[PDB]
């Protein structure tokens with residue numbers, strides 16, 4: 190029993206973390222085979238933060254200008270190129286700890302773990318969601334860029350996120366591992382703000398199912414609802430529309446608990462309209478939306494890697 | 495910016511996890527040098543759960559009766575003994591991935607990361623606190639026992655917890671790595687219940703300091719308080735007494751923010767007496783008490799390992 194915001198084991202990613210330095214700027218890099226991937230703003234100068242000329246900045250660099258260190262070992266850079274907003278530094282040594290891996294581009298609503306790093310060394314690991322507005326609610330300081338987000342399937346690490354930016358109100362923006370930003374963000378210091386965020390409805394429902402599995406059942410009412418009538422209420426409280434794909438994705442949890450998805454929707458409708466009246470669900474006074482249906486099953490069934 | 499329930503990187507502990515099997519019972523073990531540590535109730539039978547005769551059960555075991563596997567590799571057991579509530583299985587191979595480590599017994603209020611494992615493989619990592627009533631609010635299923643809790647200092651893993659039991663209301667009990675339970679719990683199936691829990695006051699204050707560091711400042715009032723008058727209010731709301739050692743431990747955060755500890759105490763007093771009125775602090779509608787002062791500094795200053 191119990192339900193926790195649980196991250197993936199980070200060991201496979203820890204063995205890929207390095208530091209990249211240009212001048213006085215040090216960030217993290219990700220070392221896979223004989224390539225180090227890092228944010229291209231490592232080559233920025235204090236002068237030209239507002240709108241860096243990345244191509245000119247990179248042209249003026251030689252391989253020797255990139256100081257790449259893995260632990261206490263310097264890795265010699267033998268080539269370099271820019272792919273969208275990331276640098277690819279070819280090094281003369283393949284990472285012997287390279288896991289089986291994939292580069293993936295996740296969808297809003299999906300979750301992943303972040304290994305927060307400084308100077309190529311890990312600080313901690315936590316679980317995030319790609320918000321509907323393509324930000325993430327992370328915890329990042331100066332020097333954290335190049336930290337990555339990931340999922341693990343079995344033995345395979347799917348890298349989905351590399352950190353680049355902090356946006357107003359303390360939320361975070363970054364790219365996939367091909368250097369393409371999630372959302373309408375750019376890697377320069379310019380007026381940027383996320384669109385209005387929304388609550389990930391299918392995830393709230395998955396978390397309510399987790400509550401039921403854990404015996405926290407007080408919010409279950411006697412009613413049902415149509416999908417359309419539910420979504421009319423969801424819209425008012427800034428919840429995303431629930432789709433039939435979402436309903437089908439909740440199938441395993443609905444089957445395990447014997448609660449039809451639309452019946453859970455009726456209970457969620459009542460929570461939205463009436464509040465929780467000082468009660469908690471799984472220890473929280475707010476409805477949680479950063480657990481996917483798959484996260485709930487993984488945690489409640491003990492899936493390992 | 496940002497503040498997350500952040501766990502330690504788990505790689506060093508992942509390389510120590512094995513599975514131990516007796517009959518049809520498989521749990522996790524921790525492999526350090528040439529010893530595997532695991533919960534002794536691995537040798538239990540379905541018959542004698544209410545009050546197992548551990549010494550008789552172990553006498554009847556030979557080394558060959560313990561099936562210890564590291565990944566897909568069987569480790570041959572060459573000796574075995576019982577230390578309080580843990581077994582020590584001597585194996586013929588020293589773990590080549592053994593980190594620098596220490597066995598420590600933590601105090602209530604302190605925090606650690608748990609690497610939840612099944613069949614010797616990790617499922618996920620999360621951050622816990624040793625509650626004042628010597629339970630932890632974990633997430634554990636059948637087969638999770640032998641999972642361990644830990645802190646990392648620099649390169650050194652301090653193991654502090656190994657999981658044994660789930661108590662009524664879905665909270666968890668276990669031992670240090672010398673097999674001594676935290677709290678008044680025993681490893682048998684008998685009526686056990688935790689004493690009343692309390693809120694870890696020094697941790698709530700540390701988390702309020704984290705809020706201020708992140709610019710979430712609305713709860714700061716214009717008042718101050720004496721330590722004694724604060725503790726009279728704390729007692730009413732089931733908060734632990736704040737000691738002078740706690741005040742001094744908050745020194746770094748008080749210095750960074752320029753807010754005296756007793757001034758923060760006045761703001762916390764007002765929160766306890768008046769509630770939050772639907773507002774949140776660092777995204778939470780409840781006051782959080784599972785971040786220590788050291789956790790806050792680590793996360794807000796980017797300490798690495």
Ligand SMILES: CC(C)(C)[C@H](NC(=O)C(F)(F)F)C(=O)N1CC2(C[C@H]1C(=O)N[C@H](C#N)C[C@@H]1CCNC1=O)SCCS2
Nearest residue numbers: 230329330331332333334353354355356376377378379381
């Ligand atoms: C938050 C800022 C105001 C400084 C800025 N943000 C924006 O300009 C906004 F998005 F608001 F438009 C921003 O993030 N920058 C500015 C550049 C680098 C990058 C950056 O510091 N990235 C860090 C890494 N390493 C991680 C940051 C540091 C704080 N916490 C994080 O997560 S962009 C390329 C030229 S300098």
Ligand SMILES: CC(C)(C)[C@H](NC(=O)C(F)(F)F)C(=O)N1CC2(C[C@H]1C(=O)N[C@H](C#N)C[C@@H]1CCNC1=O)SCCS2
Nearest residue numbers: 535634635636637638639658659660661681682683684686
């Ligand atoms: C929860 C129980 C009612 C089953 C029981 N608890 C109690 O008896 C109480 F504490 F309430 F008094 C308990 O935990 N037991 C019974 C024994 C083993 C141990 C146990 O199953 N430990 C698991 C491991 N592996 C981890 C558990 C499984 C569920 N989630 C967990 O965390 S004690 C030694 C003889 S059988």
